[PDB]
Structure formats: C-alpha cells, structure tokens
Amino acid sequence: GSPGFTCCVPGCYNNSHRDKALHFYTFPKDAELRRLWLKNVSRAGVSGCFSTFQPTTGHRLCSVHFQGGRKTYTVRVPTIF
C-alpha cells in the first residue's frame, strides 16, 4: 500500500510511517467522531502542515490502544500515550 501511515504511534503497536505490516482498525460511520480520531492519529505532520499521510486514502488505527479489546471500560478514542 502507501509508503506509511501505520498509526502515528508514539507508543502503541506500529506507527503511521515505520511498519505498515501489522493490523489496523477503520474509521467509525459518523463523520465527526471520525475527525475526533483524526486527533489521536497525529495532525498537521505533528509539526508542519505539509500534507503527508493525508487522511483521504483511508486512515486506520493500530492494535495495542484500547483496553482488553473491542473498546470498553472507559476508552472509546484510541489515544493511549
């Protein structure tokens, strides 16, 4: 696929540009909640508003973020960092 975008992982599974070979979850059905995730996923290049990993091709998230599994307990948005 793309040259990267394996979840801007500051510490979770694999990150938005250093693996691309593990599992990724997809974006909810509700547009906004989606943009909310946009946040947890990274942002304007995490420094400059270049455009890389543009969340158009379909940005998905990596494993080790939710607790237990299937989203529950309290964590809804994959931000664990």
The whole-angstrom distance between residue 42's C-alpha and the CA centroid of its chain comes to: 7
Which of 5, 7, 42, 66 touches Zn ion by CB under 5 A?
7
Q: What is the Cα–Cα distance from 66 to 45, expressed in whole angstroms?
A: 24
9 touches Zn ion (CB under 5 A): yes
Count Cα neighbours of 22 within 13 Å in the Cβ-side half-sphere: 18
41 touches Zn ion (CB under 5 A): no
Nearer to Zn ion, 18 or 35 (CB): 18
12 touches Zn ion (CB under 5 A): yes
Residues near Zn ion (CB under 5 A) are: 7, 9, 12-13, 62
